[PDB]
Amino acid sequence: PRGSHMNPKRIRALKSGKQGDGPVVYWMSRDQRAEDNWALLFSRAIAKEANVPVVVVFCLTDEFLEAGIRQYEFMLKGLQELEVSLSRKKIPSFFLRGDPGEKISRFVKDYNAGTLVTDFSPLRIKNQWIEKVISGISIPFFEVDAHNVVPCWEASQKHEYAAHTFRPKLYALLPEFLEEFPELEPNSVTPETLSDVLETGVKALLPERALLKNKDPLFEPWHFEPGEKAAKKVMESFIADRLDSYGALRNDPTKNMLSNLSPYLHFGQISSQRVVLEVEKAESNPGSKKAFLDEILIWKEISDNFCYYNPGYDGFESFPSWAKESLNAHRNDVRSHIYTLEEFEAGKTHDPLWNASQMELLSTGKMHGYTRMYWAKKILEWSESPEKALEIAICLNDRYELDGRDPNGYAGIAWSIGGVHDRAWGEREVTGKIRYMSYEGCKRKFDVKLYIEKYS
DNA sequence: CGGCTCGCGCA
DNA sequence: TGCGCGAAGCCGAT
Ligand SMILES: Cc1cc2nc3c(=O)[nH]c(=O)nc-3n(C[C@H](O)[C@H](O)[C@H](O)COP(=O)(O)OP(=O)(O)OC[C@H]3O[C@@H](n4cnc5c(N)ncnc54)[C@H](O)[C@@H]3O)c2cc1C
């Protein structure tokens, strides 16, 4: 659909029909940003060709009840800034509350939308919402992959077994899709309160808050300032003083040598393509640059591939055949310890290293990348069954992680528990051939004592 | 057949 | 600390 700096492969038609005479409505669900948003840019270009204004519609679902205050405030303060940024470009934004399958279809009919465009997410509930929109509307419906550098349906057409099978495919398409973003043009044609939605939601999630013994909240909200502007500064700081040492100290939780970009990446407050463009041009350690690029390009986008082609990405059935057979044979093995969800949640296990990992998650909302493996694998070792451990790991991940409820989370848990995108290892009791980590193994890599004392 | 994102002995 | 082997199933280039 026209455009000189737009690859047509980033868009795909979900519904074909007669284009209406009204404004083009952009349904924002995953990429909550104004700059470096392909879905917003593609919606603006279609509006420009048809001589119509562009409007942004967001649907606030009841999903925040399952999560906590920390993610709700992080998102809401992000959208409040996004409202002002879109207003500076004369692009009105509408915030709806209710079922997306019913309210979004009603908005298109009420506002007489000419064309509807939305971002891409391989999550199950997004596809269900999309199908309900299809049956209700008659305007054309398009979908744009504004999250991945290479669109998920173009990088691969099947479930990839491992990265070494996905890395050559992904890197082969970099010269085509790795390009600079064009500036978003303001609207020429001019035509609920976010504060009220925030105050009402907070009161509902107040009883479910995480508290200490003295009825004091555990979450520390000053570690990550939400929004698009703050996400840019985090990326700038990481490239400047942190990217050089990333290759060596990325596995040391005692050092703050990570990019800390996951909370902004999950909510789409910064584009991974923009980060890739800046990292590529930056002159840093070649080993560190390669290590970081493998995480933000191969592993981040292969998680989207895993969820898009495996609808049961959060289930035991998504595990490979070798993993299921090994875990099934060890179902009746006696576990060293058995802990419930509440015991895991409160960090009341015999392992000080595991408790410190959970305490960091409870306080900061973002556990270090290395300890998250030990966090998830010990859940498998000290649970009733691999189904319960998968249930517990997912429940704690999506509740307390700022970057939770993300395809990286489900694929990351499947790696640690089900060996997805991994290989078999030495046979062991209970865990079987799933990759094994030990407290002693962490002692030979980093100062475990410093990590434990930092989080009680 | 080669090579994949742990533990462990060893400088 | 960094290095090399060990224990293990399978994809994919042929
Ligand atoms: C059991 C488990 C659960 C996880 N839960 C989540 C989750 O809910 N949400 C989430 O976003 N990530 C999750 N991850 C992935 C990983 O822990 C985080 O992406 C990362 O630790 C966030 O810190 P960072 O961005 O500073 O790391 P960095 O090293 O700076 O990572 C840079 C970026 O690369 C991507 N990335 C890095 N490591 C991975 C990985 N292993 N898999 C996929 N993408 C990766 C992310 O987009 C991240 O923002 C989980 C991992 C495991 C093992």
For the four alpha carbons of A298, A303, A304 and A308, in that order, the dihedral sign comes to: positive
Name beta bridge partners: A12.
A143
C-beta separation of A407 from A303 below 8 A:
yes
Q: In residues, how long is chain A?
A: 456
Q: Distance between alpha carbon A230 and the CA centroid of its chain, in Å?
A: 18
- Of A71, A251, A295, which is best to mutate to test ligand 1, by the most ligand atoms within 8 angstroms of its C-beta? A295
For residue A302, the ligand 1 atom closest to its alpha carbon is 43
Order of strands, sheet of A141-144, starting from the edge strand that comes earlier in the sequence: A11-15, A141-144, A115-119, A24-28, A54-60, A93-97
Which nucleotide C1' is nearest A433 CA?
C8
HEC readout, chain A: CCCCCCCHHHEEEEECCCCCCCCEEEEECCCCCCCCCHHHHHHHHHHHHCCCCEEEEEEECHHHHCCCHHHHHHHHHHHHHHHHHHHHCCCCEEEEECCHHHHHHHHHHHHCCCEEEEECCCCHHHHHHHHHHHHHCCCCEEEECCCCCCCHHHHCCCCCCCHHHHHHHHHHCHHHHCCCCCCCCCCCCCCCCHHHHHHHHHHHHCCCCCECCCCCECCCCCCCCCCHHHHHHHHHHHHHHHCCCHHHHCCCCCCCCCCCCHHHHHCCCCCHHHHHHHHHHCCCCHHHHHHHHHHHHHHHHHHHHHHHHCCCCCCHHHCCHHHHHHHHHCCCCCCCCCCCHHHHHCCCCCCHHHHHHHHHHHHHCCCCHHHHHHHHHHHHHCCCCHHHHHHHHHHHHHHHCCCCCCHHHHHHHHHHHHCCCCCCCCCECCCECCCCCCHHHHHCCCCHHHHHHHCC
Kindly report the number of other CB atoms within 10 A of residue A236's CB atom: 11
Q: A13: which 2 tokens? A: 């038609």
Rounded to an integer, what distance in angstroms lies between the CA atom of residue A455 and that of residue A452? Answer: 6
C-beta separation of A337 from A434 below 8 A:
no
C-beta separation of A268 from A228 below 8 A:
no
Q: By C-alpha distance, which of A267, A256, A259, A272 is closest to A233?
A: A259
Closest residue to B8 measured CA to C1′: A441
Q: By C-alpha distance, which of A199, A171, A25 is closest to A110?
A: A25
CA R_g for chain A: 22
C-beta separation of A148 from A299 below 8 A:
no
For residue A263, the ligand 1 atom closest to its alpha carbon is 11
| In chain A, residues 262 through 321 whose Cβ sits under 7 angstroms from any atom of nucleic acid strand B | 294-295, 299
For residue A406, the ligand 1 atom closest to its alpha carbon is 9
Phi, psi angle pair for A190, to nearest 5°: -75, -60
Q: By C-alpha distance, which of A7, A42, A10 is closest to A27?
A: A42
Buried b (16+ CB within 10 A) or exposed e, A246-257: bbebbbbbebeb
Q: Is A437 exposed, middle or buried (0-12, 13-18, 19+ CB in 10 A)?
A: middle
* Nucleotides of chain B touched by protein CB (<7 A): 3-10
Angstrom CA distances, A95 to A61, A127, A210, A436, stand at: 11, 20, 28, 46
Q: How many Å does it take to go from CA A146 to C1' C12?
A: 31
Q: What is the resolution of this structure in A?
A: 2.2
C-beta separation of A197 from A456 below 8 A:
no
Q: CB neighbours of A443 closer than 8 A, spacing ≥ 6? A: none
Q: How many Å does it take to go from CA A58 to C1' C4?
A: 54
Angstrom CA distances, A26 to A113, A243, A296, A369, stand at: 10, 35, 26, 34
Rounded to an integer, what distance in angstroms lies between the CA atom of residue A72 and that of residue A413? Answer: 23
Kindly report the number of other CB atoms within 10 A of residue A277's CB atom: 17
Rounded to an integer, what distance in angstroms lies between the CA atom of residue A394 and that of residue A414? Answer: 10
Q: A350: which 2 tokens? A: 């015999």
Q: Distance between alpha carbon A359 and the CA centroid of its chain, in Å?
A: 22
For residue A397, the ligand 1 atom closest to its alpha carbon is 8
- Of A121, A239, A403, which is best to mutate to test ligand 1, by the most ligand atoms within 8 angstroms of its C-beta? A403
Q: Is A295 exposed, middle or buried (0-12, 13-18, 19+ CB in 10 A)?
A: middle
Q: Which experimental approach was used here?
A: X-ray
- Of A408, A410, A416, which is best to mutate to test ligand 1, by the most ligand atoms within 8 angstroms of its C-beta? A408
Q: How many Å does it take to go from CA A439 to C1' C6?
A: 20
Characterize the bridge pairing of strands A93-97 and A115-119: unpaired
Query: What is the CB < 6 Å shell around ligand 1?
Result: A 250, 258-262, 265-266, 295-296, 299-300, 303, 369, 372-373, 376, 397, 401, 403-404, 406, 408-409, 412-413, 415-416
Q: A189: which 2 tokens? A: 């044609």
C-beta separation of A327 from A441 below 8 A:
no
Q: Is A73 exposed, middle or buried (0-12, 13-18, 19+ CB in 10 A)?
A: middle
Q: A223: which 2 tokens? A: 């570690």
Cα(A442) to ligand 1 centroid in Å equals 19
Kindly report the number of other CB atoms within 10 A of residue A84's CB atom: 10
Q: How many Å does it take to go from CA A69 to C1' B7?
A: 40
Closest residue to B3 measured CA to C1′: A164
